[PDB]
Amino acid sequence: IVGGYTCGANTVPYQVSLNSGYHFCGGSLINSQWVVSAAHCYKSGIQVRLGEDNINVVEGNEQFISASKSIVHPSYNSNTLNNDIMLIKLKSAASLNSRVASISLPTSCASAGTQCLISGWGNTKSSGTSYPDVLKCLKAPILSDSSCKSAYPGQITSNMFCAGYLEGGKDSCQGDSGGPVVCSGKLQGIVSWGSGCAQKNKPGVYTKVCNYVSWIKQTIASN
Numbered sequence: 447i448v449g450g451y452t453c454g455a456n457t458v459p460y461q462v463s464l465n466s467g468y469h470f471c472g473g474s475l476i477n478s479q480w481v482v483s484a485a486h487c488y489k490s491g492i493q494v495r496l497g498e499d500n501i502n503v504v505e506g507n508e509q510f511i512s513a514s515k516s517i518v519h520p521s522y523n524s525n526t527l528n529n530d531i532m533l534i535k536l537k538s539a540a541s542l543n544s545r546v547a548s549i550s551l552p553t554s555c556a557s558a559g560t561q562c563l564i565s566g567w568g569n570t571k572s573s574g575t576s577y578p579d580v581l582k583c584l585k586a587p588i589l590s591d592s593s594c595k596s597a598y599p600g601q602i603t604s605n606m607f608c609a610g611y612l613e614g615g616k617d618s619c620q621g622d623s624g625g626p627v628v629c630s631g632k633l634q635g636i637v638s639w640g641s642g643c644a645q646k647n648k649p650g651v652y653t654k655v656c657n658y659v660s661w662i663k664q665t666i667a668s669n
């Protein structure tokens with residue numbers, strides 16, 4: 447997260463780290479057995495780590511559960527990143543308490559101007575690299591689809607939204623992929639991609655979760 451703040455231990459309780467020997471992606475817990483993340487985060491042998499703050503120290507609130515299945519969206523296109531969303535089923539249900547909890551799925555799409563919380567363990571520098579060990583948080587508005595489209599000409603599909611600061615300075619970055627964009631208490635986006643991090647006139651682009659609500663409910667009901 448570039449230009450954000452230390453969240454505080456377990457203040458973002460649906461935040462998961464996806465681990466295959468090291469943290470490689472974030473995700474959100476949507477019920478005790480399923481996580482949503484970005485399809486570009488796919489790999490075999492994911493261990494899901496819940497109740498995390500410092501990802502390098504066991505502090506006592508952690509639940510590490512292996513993934514049983516991963517389902518990348520049927521129309522995920524890696525060359526355009528259209529439909530960049532995946533579901534991960536846990537091998538056992540997580541225990542939900544105040545520090546480990548699920549995030550609500552939206553029933554409406556969020557409007558531009560809505561403020562959102564984006565969180566994660568990715569790079570905190572626009573140029574150069576420092577990866578935090580503790581979870582960082584960023585509050586950012588959803589930008590209008592005209593500003594988004596003028597910033598990324600011929601690249602925003604109807605399943606993408608931009609959130610951030612056109613002036614730059616604050617943004618999601620490498621290592622935040624798959625993590626939550628939560629607006630008004632509902633999960634509205636997934637950290638997807640952008641031209642670098644925190645560059646002027648290049649805000650982050652996010653998978654628009656409200657467009658996937660029926661595919662998510664359907665898939666959970668049948669697996």
Ligand SMILES: *[B](O[C][C])(O[C][C])[C]([C][C][C][C][N])[N]C(=O)[C]([N]C(=O)[C]([C])[N]C(=O)OC([C])([C])[C])[C]([C])[C]
Nearest residue numbers: 470471486618619620621622623638639640641642650
């Ligand atoms: B993400 O985070 C860690 C798992 O995923 C893999 C490195 C990161 C999140 C970036 C958020 C930025 N606001 N996602 C990516 O790096 C994705 N790639 C891009 O965004 C690239 C760097 N963008 C790019 O080349 O820009 C254009 C010229 C506009 C195409 C990708 C791996 C999904």
